[model samples]
Structure formats: structure tokens, C-alpha cells
Target: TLVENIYASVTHNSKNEKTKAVLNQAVADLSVAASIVHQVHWYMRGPGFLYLHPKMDELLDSLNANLDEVSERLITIGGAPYSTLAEFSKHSKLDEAKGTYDKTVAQHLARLVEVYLYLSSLYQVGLDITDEEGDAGTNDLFTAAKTEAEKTIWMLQAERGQGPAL
Candidate 1:
């Protein structure tokens, strides 16, 4: 049923299966990323708790917002997004985050920066495919998310005492 919707959408878009997969996987990965960010938001403590706590919450808000947008965007384009954790895990680009307390706040920030960069790259791939398909609306969504992820990487790297990657 869902797979048929995917193929139907792809066929309608001139065999743009790659573009559809890119969008769906983005929804899956973004869903997982948001949950991981939310978990880290709660586990944050120590020296920078006062500052980093709210910052972590802010990240969760961003991640969750993006997750919702991309998932609903999949529907807008006639493809059903992954609806369960099982489906999400199958399609996700990133691993689920464990409730890790062994790492310092800086370590968490650094790790998140790395994840965000990786996610941005994923969005770039999606953007490229959507561009090729002449899907300006989907391309816009990818660009918006990619831009935010890049900025988040910059901010997180600054927190980790690292220079901006770009």
C-alpha cells in the first residue's frame, strides 16, 4: 500500500524514485535526530547547565519542527512517510542515541555538531535530486533545513571550542 504510493508518486514524477527516497529517508532520519536531540536536552548537566540546558531545548525545538515539516511534506507529494519506529530505523541515516551520561557537555555538543553536519550533507543530496526533478518546493525545504543545520553546526562547534567548519 505505502510502497505503491511511493511508486505511483515516482511514476507521476517521471521515475523520480531517487528523489522520493531522498525525501522519505530525510523524514525518517530527521525523526530519529529530533528524538536524540530531545534526549540529550534532558540529560544535559554540569558546568554549562545553566546556558546549555536552554540551548539543548532550543535544538530539540528546531529538530522537532523540521521533523514535522519533512514528514508532512512527504504526504504533500503523495508519498507516505515512515510512521513507526521500526520503519524509521529501517530508513534512518543516523543511529539512535543512547542515554549516555559518560560524556561531558562539551562532548555532547561536539557529537551533535558532527551529526548536524552529516544531516546537512544528507539534505544536500536530497536537494540535488529534487533540483534535477524540477521540484522547486521540495528543493526549498531541503535548502532551508540544510542552512539551519549548518548554522547549528557552527554554534555547536563554537561551544566545543572549535572553529567553524566553513
Candidate 2:
């Protein structure tokens, strides 16, 4: 009875419901993004491999951490996060094409730039929802994630000899 009451209270809060939805969406997107980065790390070739290979590892670690935090936050607020590959594939908005061997180093970097831009947009959505829902903790998380994605985008664009416009 006590457990049921608590669960009902957590689940019935409309604000928390919106926040949870955003968090779970983040979980799906981040999981897919990490896999894409791993693919890039493995398939990348010709020039910048020495540095970019290790950089992808770092990016993967960051994405994993973000997803973990988002999932845990969802659970904390009485929401279930999507954990399976099938769930991620179904919910994720990013493209999931298999990595090809013919892609060059520049192409890989360009793709990364696109991915980060998508991630940044998602974080922006998270920021807006969390702010409206009065979830300061989730808002802070989204803020940090957005900053990281923006920085990554800048670096990737610079690597490709383009200015970080807009």
C-alpha cells in the first residue's frame, strides 16, 4: 500500500512525466550516438588516425556517461528508460546506417559534426523542458551536455577547415 502510494504520486506528476519523457529520449539518442562514434573510430582511415582514434574513445566515454546519468535520472523520477538495442533503434532520431570502409577521414569527421549538432539540439530540448518542469537537476545536466556537444562540434568543424558558424 505504501509502495503503491509512492509510485502513484511519482507517476501522476505531469511535470515529472514530461521530464521523464525527455530523459528517456536522451537515453535512446545517446546510446545510438555512442555506437556511431565507435563505428567511426574503427572505420576511420588515412590521416589524423593517430589523434582522432583516441579522441573517438573519449567521445564514446562521454556519451556513455551522459546516457547513464540520464537513465538513472529517469529511474529516480519513477520512469523506465529504454535499455535494449531494439528500443534505442525504435526511439532514436538519428540515422543508423552501417559504417562503410570507403569513407575517408574527412568524411568521418564531417559525420561526427552532424551527429554532435543533432545531440546539441536534443540537449536544447531537454533544457527547455526541464526548465519549464522545474527540474533543476535535469536542467543542469542538459546544460553541461549541450556545452560539451557545442565544443565537440566546433572542434570537428575546425578539423574540417570550416568556421564554426551559427
Candidate 3:
């Protein structure tokens, strides 16, 4: 019943519209998140190594864990997962940064804000769809995700003085 409802909702909406685009963004966002975390995990040379390495690894864990869940849910809805780097880059509303931790903390968090802003807005739409469809399961997932994303937005804002708006 949940799968059927998801399929129906998706079908009623245009396929290439923002919903699918956002989902694809998640796939690549998670992929890039993974790549970035591990990349910095190894090459990071700094005063905060004791703190930052584990922290970066932790971010990878958080990113991929949710990544798997969302991708699986998409499959449940009969949506194909965007598993390739090329596709993820193509569909991502969040621009992927080019290369290593040569950048500073501000830049990283700025990127995080960009990605989360996209995900949060995209996911908020998904939340409305879930509500409209009376799909409590889906709604619950989006709610948790959006809350975490808001916290992320807050943290990023505190760092960047952007001061979360959404």
C-alpha cells in the first residue's frame, strides 16, 4: 500500500521536476560527502587532527547512513537510485566543489549550507507530499531529516553568520 501510494504520487507529478532532481541530489550529495570525508580523513594535516579526523569520519557516517535509507526508500517507491557520479553531478542542485581540504572550515561549512539548503527545501516538498498522501511513514522520515538539516543549517549559520532563514 505504501509503495503503491508513493508510485501514484510520483506518477501524478511530472517525473523530471524538482522532486526527482532533489532525490538525485541526495544520491550525489551523499556520494560527494563520502568522498570528501574520506579524502580529508587521510590528508588532513592540522592542529585539530585529534578532533577533526574523527569528526570528519563521523560526518561521513551520518551522511551515508541517511543516504542508504533515502535511496532504499526511493526504490520502494519504484524510483531508480542515481548511483553514478556523473548522474549525481548532473542532477545535483548543490554544486560539487573541486578538490581537497586545501580549503578552510568556512568554505566547507559554506558548501554544507548550500547542499543542506537544497536538501531541506527539496525534502520539505517531499514532506508535504507525504502529508497530502496520508503516508505517515514517509512523513516521519522527512520530518526527522528536515529537523536534522535545520540543525545543520543553524550550525552552518553560526559559523558563517548566514543565520538560518528556513
How many steric clashes between backbone atoms does each model show?
Answer: 0, 0, 0
RMSD of every candidate to native, in Å, equals 6.0, 8.0, 6.5
Q: Where does candidate 3 clash, by residue pair?
A: none
Return the top candidate by lDDT: 2
Where in model 1 is the C-alpha error above 4 Å?
Answer: 1-14
lDDT of 3 by residue, 85-125 (tens): 78766654445445665766665656667666766765676
The lDDT of each candidate is: 0.76, 0.83, 0.65
In angstroms, give how far residue 159 of model 2 lies from its true place. Answer: 0.7
Q: 1-166, model 1: which lDDT tens digit per residue?
A: 3334433443343455667777787778777787777767778767988888788778878887888888788788877788898888876757865687776887778668767977887777777678878888889998999999988887788778887775
lDDT leaderboard ranking: 2, 1, 3
How would you encode candidate 2's per-residue C-alpha lDDT over 1-166 as one tens digit per residue? Answer: 3223323333344547778877887898899999999999898888779999999999999999999999998998889999899999887777878778899998888888888887787777777777878999989999999999998888889889997753
| Maximum-TM-score candidate | 2
User: Looking at model 3, which ten-residue stretch has the lowest summed lDDT?
Assistant: 1-10
Steric clash pairs (candidate 2): none
State the displacement of the C-alpha of residue 36, model 2, in Å, after optimal TM-score superposition: 0.4
